[PDB]
Amino acid sequence: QAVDETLTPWTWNNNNFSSLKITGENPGSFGLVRSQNDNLNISSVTKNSSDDNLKYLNAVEKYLDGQQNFAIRRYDNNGRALYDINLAKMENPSTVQRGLNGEPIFDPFKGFGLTGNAPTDWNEIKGKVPVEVVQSPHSPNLYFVLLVPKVALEYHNLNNQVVKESLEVKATQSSFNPTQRLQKDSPVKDSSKQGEKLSETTASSMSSGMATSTRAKALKVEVERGSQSDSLLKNDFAKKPLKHKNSSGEVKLEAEKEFTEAWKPLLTTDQIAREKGMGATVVSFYDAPYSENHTAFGLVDHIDPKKMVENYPPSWKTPKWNHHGIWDYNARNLLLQTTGFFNPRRHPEWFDEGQAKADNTSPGFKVGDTDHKKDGFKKNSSSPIALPFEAYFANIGNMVAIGNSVFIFGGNGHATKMFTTNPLSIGVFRIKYTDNFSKSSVTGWPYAVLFGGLINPQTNGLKDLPLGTNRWFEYVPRMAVSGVKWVGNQLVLAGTLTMGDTATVPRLKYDQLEKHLNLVAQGQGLLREDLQIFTPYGWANRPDIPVGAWLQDEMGSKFGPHYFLNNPDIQDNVNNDTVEALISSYKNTDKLKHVYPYRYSGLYAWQLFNWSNKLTNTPLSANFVNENSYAPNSLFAAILNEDLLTGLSDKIFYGKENEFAENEADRFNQLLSLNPNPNTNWARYLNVVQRFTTGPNLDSSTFDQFLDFLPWIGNGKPFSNSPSSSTPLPTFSNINVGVKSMITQHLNKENTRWVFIPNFSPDIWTGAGYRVQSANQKNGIPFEQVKPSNNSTPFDPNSDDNKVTPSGGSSKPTTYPALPNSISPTSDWINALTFTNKNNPQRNQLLLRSLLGTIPVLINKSGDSNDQFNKDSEQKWDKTETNEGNLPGFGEVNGLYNAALLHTYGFFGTNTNSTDPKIGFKADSSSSSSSTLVGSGLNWTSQDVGNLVVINDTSFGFQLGGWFITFTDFIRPRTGYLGITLSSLQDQTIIWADQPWTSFKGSYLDSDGTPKSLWDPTALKSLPNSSTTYDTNPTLSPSFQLYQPNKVKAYQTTNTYNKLIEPVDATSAATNMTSLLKLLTTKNIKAKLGKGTASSQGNNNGGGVSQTINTITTTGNISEGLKEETSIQAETLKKFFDSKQNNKSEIGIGDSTFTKMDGKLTGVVSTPLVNLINGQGATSDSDTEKISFKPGNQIDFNRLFTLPVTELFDPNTMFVYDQYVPLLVNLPSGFDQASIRLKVISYSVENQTLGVRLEFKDPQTQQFIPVLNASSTGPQTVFQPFNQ
């Protein structure tokens, strides 16, 4: 039980927690420690055919019991280890001999009363490593230890055959086709159900209608209950004119042949619940640093995923459905995309069957039946959402206790994070305790109900985020945990969570799946990349048009008022006569809703502002929720009500509204609000989030100007590059890009001079990719965006149909005169909210993945000879309207400029490599251009998170990727402050290594006042094999994804982007771009860059400690940067940055200071005086070296009558009065009468024994502390005056 030098301090890569700063009476830390023994034969246990995962992991665990052990080495504020508590090899432990009502009997010296026998389940609990330990400050001297199974500890070393990556590679000795795993065949019209297409209404309802419209007339959509069990009388939604192309058989999503070797968990939710030894556990116990009974135990409690399963909203059981569930279901079928909102196909981590249900059948409702009315009634649901092994293990970590109850807020997933699959914590866990920690109940919640009550007024960051929800909890949050800490007087949760997917919110025209590879893959599930790609040509007029309303104009020459490819160049006016002529007369009742011929349109921004779950000032206000994203693309930091969370009840009951609509008759009249049955407690949990933030408290294009300012660790050069005429342009911010165009000439040309710009001259920068008539006239563009479907002449405005006639016959056109001058991938429009593209999902996701530093690129030419995108004569930045700017306009990630991005990277030029890599994008006009995306070389994944270091009650932070954020102004935001401060990382070898997160070994706050993080360059866990031994074109990595090809039509040399750049059928373009896909692998990327091996030079290994930059309270101030209403905030802060670009320190940008010390760094230990590193640095209270306990020599004793004592202390403050301080402790130095004190701990009237612990005003921290060198035994000492 004594200290064992063999075992060493460490820190697990799920929570990274081995040092709890203990305070109160016995400051120190429950030092978490493991043997530093390497050379562990993982391959010993073989997963044969007969054995299952359960017994295989049992064999692994028992073999490790025979090969490894763990203990918790409690530390003292001095830094002297006392005892370890080895769970495996501790003999005959005991729990506290509590009282009748539950109090623990603890004589300070005789110690906590033992029961002789410890909590049961020794066999299956001694084999669980301690990964975490927490303190309960409400109750006295209570402690927990988080027992996690060790298969997590050795998780990454198990045979890959069982733990299978989601992506399949095999030999694939045929180049590597990123599209050969994507279902690419488009839907087609059926040849047997022609007459069931949605039918145009019989006769328009005049209703005293004075307005007349020459355009096509609306569709009549109604569903009536009638009288039938499994059918109805008329189901207009269930019309399904389209069908899967019969190309080499049906094209459909079905796992049993779309996944030869499918992703699959290890242990199901029920399996882990029933199994005890393989599941986590939290144990209440008690520590006695100065008693012969050093340790005593309380209660042992398991964490049951059955509480997760029972506490999900009923709708979660049927994720393949959704609140819409009928038209959207059919659309997803036909477009070959996500079925539901959280199907396994796009998110298998949480499905206990894994990808085995990566299909469409069995959505909880009747589907596929011939008669359209028949489909829609509920039936068996075989695809529920549960907590499989990986997700459950990600659901453990950073637990904290409040009052009489404890919470486990989830791990971070690295322990079970494989190379591309991203599991994480989905639902919070709660534990309570009854009758003074005598019994407990295990319960857990879904974070969806925790986060349902979100509204923009809460956060000071970016607005309209995809965070809200509706009465159906088809929103699937999941937190990446930085460590919930009791920051000051508020409780803070920080890290990242997965936004509701804002990428696949648009849809694809039925005949446009073979030329939108980018987004079709981004949606189907073969592209786990969560940035958000820009392909505007093929979007629908509304993403939510029922399929039966798609073929009313199949040719598209008439331009399909009900359904047509989105192009707001033609968007109908919102003019009065226009609206009351097109939409009003088609009034919709409860039973019937009118799909209006009106030509809705708009670029991706308007598309999202309509059909994305943007946060509105009222919570529970997200009706259009498409899907939940891939991996955390949202930095997060919120404050969670301690008192409320304590109050909330364990079990959750759901009302009628929680489940889905019984039948489509009811569905047709869905509401966002309904009366919950008062006997249900689910909605109690709603308003728990006080606020939240993801980035600095900035809005609009100014936020992306900040994005421009932030630098890239891969080179350190910021994106702008302006300091030191065909020069690189800013990529994120469009300020000072292109030419200034007038919003006054945009669209209606009316009421715009002082609407979106508070200046006499509304001058804004159209951005890169813009077009204009000519240098003479730039503001606005005449309607030359005319789209001719066939060769039947252009869109034909002013046509009899295209012009409306209100009462009076004054025929007028419904399409606006002058359109905006940018539909670029970086299109920026404050006014044309139907032509802008810089949405807040863009802004936040780019913040996250640019702080990570792994934003993708789009390329034409690799570094190959004769295929080199050289700089001179083919990169003319000043001219970006023509092909000289090399702007693709199709396949690039929305919100940035490809040429500028690649200059920032250094793929061409000296920015990255000594020799120009000769990799870049050309806007070739000779013929069609093939291209794709690739990784950034870096591999800082998104689930990355540090441990939340609480700097003070007003700020905090952690490390994210290679950067160190600090929420400087989140708890107490201040006007004019940027909001956050940043610190970068120095070690290049650490930066570029394969898996740079087998390097961070926990974070803490250094006593000096600035946190740090550990780095172990020798611990870099790269890929298991160098593509075995043969070079595999596809080689996995944290941030490797199937970036599909994008092949585009030829570009017109001049006036390139009048219209959208049409794509060509790129399905079979993979084999012709082998060189381009060679760069899709990070290893090849770094090989080209010249930093593929240790050739980067510099630090040999760089094993040291990195410290974030010191932040003045004014750090991050942009007070002068803002305002200046002479022009817009974006441009004024751009000028501010250009005046302070070379002062990254002031803004909050820097590189963490690094100190090199030799050693096999593995963890840290914490004492309130100072946190020590790796368990070294023994201290002996240097300041108070010359003070010790006075032996019995300086006591009366001798032989006299029973000594009367205890009169010198009172039921008041129990410290001995100042009269008799030095009677027991030697003070040859500290003779001062203003310090040096004592603290009694117990006594006995009839025996006269006195027990005290010294207490003195600590200089460094003005807090009263105990002392160890007082006596060899310890500050606690009995003073018994024997007997006569």
Short mmCIF file of C-alpha atoms in Angstrom, two decimals, residues 3 9 15 42 68 113 205 233 245 295 340 353 366 382 392 465 505 535 544 561 1098 1193 1198:
data_model
loop_
_atom_site.label_atom_id
_atom_site.label_comp_id
_atom_site.label_asym_id
_atom_site.label_seq_id
_atom_site.Cartn_x
_atom_site.Cartn_y
_atom_site.Cartn_z
CA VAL A 3 4.49 4.34 -2.22
CA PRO A 9 1.97 9.23 -12.98
CA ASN A 15 -10.37 12.86 -19.94
CA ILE A 42 -1.48 -7.03 -27.15
CA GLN A 68 -0.48 -4.59 -15.39
CA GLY A 113 -14.60 3.24 11.04
CA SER A 205 -60.41 30.46 -56.44
CA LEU A 233 -58.89 8.61 -49.18
CA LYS A 245 -32.57 4.19 -62.12
CA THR A 295 -8.72 4.75 3.41
CA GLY A 340 -34.37 10.56 -41.50
CA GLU A 353 -26.25 -2.51 -35.04
CA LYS A 366 -45.16 2.22 -43.54
CA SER A 382 -36.04 -1.71 -35.88
CA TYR A 392 -20.80 4.91 -24.10
CA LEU A 465 -26.95 28.88 -35.56
CA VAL A 505 -29.89 21.46 -46.18
CA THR A 535 -22.34 23.92 -55.83
CA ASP A 544 -38.68 20.81 -49.55
CA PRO A 561 -42.57 27.44 -61.57
CA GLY A 1098 15.16 22.34 -36.23
CA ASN A 1193 10.07 17.57 26.85
CA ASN A 1198 5.78 14.56 35.07
#
